[PDB]
Ligand binder design. Structure first.
Ligand SMILES: Nc1nc(=O)c2nc(CNc3ccc(C(=O)N[C@@H](CCC(=O)O)C(=O)O)cc3)cnc2[nH]1
Lengths: 557, 555, 140
């Protein structure tokens, strides 16, 4: 029945965003249109409503990702729409997609099926320019570092200690490890460096954590690029780059007003990695949205062991938010993959594997309660699921003390989200949250890692390479030790081993390397090897993409 | 009284107003805030047969440290024509972001002849360049990924001519090695970056007729060769769809205005050596339907921008320039007279009278295309009346109308005298446009008719590399293409020391490159800087924006 | 190659002579026809491993050290000459020599037998010296 995803995005009737904005109580002079279906909202809206109370905050998360797929944003949008159908005054805030994937494997809707934010095609490409803003702010600093050396290197940097890489928003592996500054004395200083994908830029994380443009510049001034020969850090502040970087982001700092297929207003703004960063959209968008609405849905990247953790222990920490509930999105099939059933055999009913894989969901639910937040499970309905499966899954959610609702937002838009929405409102009305970050900043890095690892991952303990132990000593010594902690780990297990599905017991995390983001204001311990610059596949989608004389776009979505 | 100041104090009409003022519907306008917008190509298609208005190329005499002010004069001529009740718009190039952080960050034009909002124009504007940058870099990545995947096309990574771009002055990226890290990480090869406005993809945007022609062009782009020597194209990599896609918006020209609310287009902006330094054909050809008068410009002196304006931009689009302006200063002609930069406040009636042979050549050159030339003598406070008056006479004795232009100071009123001379030249002096050469010649005959007629050189020489590159290019059937001379702009010759009108000299062609996508051949005489660098005290260090959005240090 | 390796170690230890590594003219040598060594980049791997710089190899008979042997009067003259070999420049533009790196005694040491000419004969037993052998374009 259901048209494809791009098909649905064409036939959406979209309201002029200017209207949606006056509807929320935003003035015309706080609105910079980008065409008629996108706008950029002033930070002055927040400033004039600073003293208003916040709407309710509803975090959407998910169980441990899998081949089987789970659909988190589809649930978020269609949760938002269901809320709107019940007369509630609500917005959803979401991350902007990286352009790159559009040409490799993806792209796909912001959400899916009948639960989307739109215009789809602008959001997947240049949208309102936020990522080029980031790309050029990042690269200017790189180019300032490099020019610095070229002009006699006054700060007495060691070019081999330089951690500030370049960025480009394409999946281009050949740029991972390069050598720059070749050609002779007139041409730079030979040094080893490389590129990361732009959404993985620390500059992207600063935008997503900054309170305004002046806070964003301040943060920029504390970005560490490298070291001197004596071992002292050198910052962007020291190069006096922050005013220029700030300049390049003067529009980028404004969140982007768009809507859902059903015309529910929505902000898309920022969009960082959720392993080396926190995988949330801008504080700016979410804080603005809490004034305009009585209800705000937002999501975080990867599973609840990562995004949800970092949403609480970093995003709210900084903004001083207090989530009111959190929705855990789950699928009967992924639970079975967690129960040990292979991809191909996931349609076959198997109540045993479902129950045994349910431990993945049970552990997350328990994790959400460790922050003092009531949890509601959404079940992403799928045609193969039997009733005996769906029912077992409710008992189980119930046995574990969580409300649960079957969700059909993909097929039925906001109507499929109403059972769930009623369980949220029902939860909001009678189990107010008691929000608490998992850990205190004045612990030691090793303390804060174990906390996360043992309480959230169910890890026995943590191991550390010499390189790790040394970084930590050095960082703690530079006074960056009372900072929050951002675990970069595989999203496919609670553990650092992507093969360990379900709820692995009797295991241990191993920290190979520790990096720093003094701009964003956090420590990044790394367990696997992180891909901060993925590559295209052998048959990339760029080969099948076209657009004809009437702008008909085949091969993209 | 500074230029940024004057840019703040502009009473800017909403763009939407002008668009419908020009007969554009509400649905052909995609606003970017109230004072910028993009016009749809449907405006051209639906007025396809309505008549072009008049085409007035502005150009200039040979560049100098005196700084002649070519754009300012274009903006101030457009303002003038508007004050005379004439339906007119100007078409100009979008400036690179990068320079704003090195030394530059200037007005589109100057003084009281600007196009606004100045600060968005120098920054992200409407993202035309990021569209270019990503369309270029996608392709690079596609080439590199190809190799990673078994290199089916059997490319020689060392032949690869397709570089990357970024729109910052970053000299550290000029020569790099990529693809390191081992079999998982690409294929080691030497390459580099070039500023984004120097892209072939920028050139293509500025010559493409529509989005599909832009795509077709991309298809023909050459990225390198196979081990056998067979060229390999973006078409072979099936990349043109994806590049066209990333440019669906950038292909539309951007409506903005002047300080006196005269509608303006800013669309495209390429290099004027390895390319042809014009704004997009799209913008000017849309602009021809929306007015009776279109002013536009081309990069560097008339020997380059103007030659390539005529022999490339017009050839492709089938335009017929009705008049041409040649800007000049008294002080610039005095540099061409031998007087150094420090001493040019001093009157010097001989140096102006030996230096005038530069302008006298350009004017003779404009006459070779069958175009009526008119001079503009950009007025300056230190210019004597005897100097100015010697100039008129010399322009007159050369058989060209001339007018004083005080647009930097007097806005559109300063440019009335010129604007009248132009309209007088248009009402009675009809151009008979003719490209300087025919495409059916061999490459070397085209460089020669260029070198001789325009640059006034006695002949042309060729290194072995040049002869072989031509031999091969001609051998691949790219012989029947126009020619885009990559030469220093500071002389008629290939020697930047030779000011004035050098006689009895030669051009030497060291190297020859191709742009099968833009559809021309690029002979190189000097070495061309495709990636400048930041200076010792860059302007990014004092650039700042405060709690109120007030911006210091930029301009 | 010892000198090359002394130049490179110099930079690694804080670069007191304040050389510009991009001005270095002293290349390496190997006595094989190996084109892939013409243009290399050395000193990669990070702070513990040298200073990234562009250099290359020439064939050993084309070494300036070969020419000094072929022009020196004895071993002490050969060392003296070694001390005047120019390797590169400082940032200010002043030349830096092997003498300045105090390499000449070691280079001299490595050549203490090499300085002696080699007695051999012709098929018909006529005595003959073979000794040295430089390029005749960039040398004599
Ligand atoms: N990607 C994707 N995601 C989806 O969620 C999806 N959903 C459908 C349609 N999904 C479904 C899911 C469940 C039932 C179903 O068995 N519903 C039960 C109700 C269960 C209960 O309330 O306990 C029924 O029989 O009514 C039907 C269709 C089709 N394609 C999809 N594709």
């Amino acid at each position: 029945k259901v048209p494809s995803d791009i098909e649905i995005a064409q036939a959406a009737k979209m309201k002029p965003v200017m209207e949606l904005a006056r509807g929320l109580g935003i003035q015309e002079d706080e609105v910079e249109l980008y065409g008629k279906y996108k706008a950029k909202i002033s930070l002055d809206v927040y400033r004039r409503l600073k003293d208003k109370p916040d709407g309710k905050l509803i975090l959407v998360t998910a169980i441990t990702p899998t081949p089987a797929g789970e659909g988190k944003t589809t649930t978020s949008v269609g949760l938002t729409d269901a809320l709107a159908r019940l007369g509630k005054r609500v917005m959803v805030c979401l991350r902007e997609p990286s352009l790159g994937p559009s040409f490799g494997i993806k792209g796909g809707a912001a959400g899916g099926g009948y639960a989307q934010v739109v215009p789809m095609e602008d959001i997947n490409l240049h949208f309102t320019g936020d990522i080029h803003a980031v790309t050029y702010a990042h690269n200017l600093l790189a180019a300032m570092v490099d020019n610095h050396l070229q002009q006699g290197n006054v700060l007495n940097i060691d070019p081999r200690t330089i951690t500030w890489r370049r960025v480009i928003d394409l999946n281009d592996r050949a740029l991972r490890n390069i050598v720059i500054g070749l050609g002779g004395k007139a041409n730079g200083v030979p040094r080893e460096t490389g590129f990361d994908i732009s959404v993985a830029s620390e500059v992207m994380a600063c935008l997503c954590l900054a309170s305004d443009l002046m806070d964003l510049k301040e943060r920029f001034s504390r970005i560490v690029v490298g070291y001197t020969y004596d071992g002292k850090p050198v910052t962007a502040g020291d190069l006096e780059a922050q005013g220029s970087m700030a300049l390049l982001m003067k529009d980028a700092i404004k969140p982007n007003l768009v809507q859902t297929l059903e015309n529910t207003p929505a902000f898309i703004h920022g969009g960082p990695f959720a392993n080396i960063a926190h995988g949330c959209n801008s504080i700016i968008a979410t804080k603005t949205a809490l004034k305009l609405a009585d209800y705000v849905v937002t999501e975080a990247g990867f599973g609840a062991d990562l995004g949800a953790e970092k949403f609480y222990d970093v995003k709210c920490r900084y903004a001083g938010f207090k989530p009111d509930a959190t929705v855990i999105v789950a699928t009967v099939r992924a639970l079975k993959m967690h129960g040990g059933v292979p991809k191909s055999d996931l349609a076959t009913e198997n109540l045993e594997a479902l129950r045994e894989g349910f431990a993945n969901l049970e552990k997350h639910i328990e994790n959400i309660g460790k922050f003092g937040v009531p949890a509601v499970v959404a079940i992403n309905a799928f045609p193969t699921d039997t009733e005996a499966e769906l029912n077992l899954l409710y008992e189980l959610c119930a046995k574990a003390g969580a409300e649960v609702a079957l969700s059909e937002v993909w097929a039925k838009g906001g109507e499929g989200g109403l059972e769930l929405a009623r369980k949220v409102l029902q939860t909001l009305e009678s189990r107010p949250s008691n929000f608490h970050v998992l850990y205190n900043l004045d612990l030691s890095i090793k303390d804060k890692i174990a906390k996360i690892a043992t309480e959230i991952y169910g890890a026995d303990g943590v191991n550390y390479t010499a390189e790790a132990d040394k970084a930590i000593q050095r960082y703690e010594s530079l006074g960056y030790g009372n900072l929050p902690v951002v675990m970069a780990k595989t999203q496919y297990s609670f553990s650092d081993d992507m093969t360990k599905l379900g709820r692995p017991r009797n295991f241990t995390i191993t920290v190979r390397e520790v990096r720093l983001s003094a701009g964003a204001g956090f420590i990044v311990p790394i367990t696997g090897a992180i891909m901060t610059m993925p590559g295209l596949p052998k048959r990339p989608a760029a080969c099948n993409i076209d657009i004809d004389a009437d702008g008909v776009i085949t091969g993209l979505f």
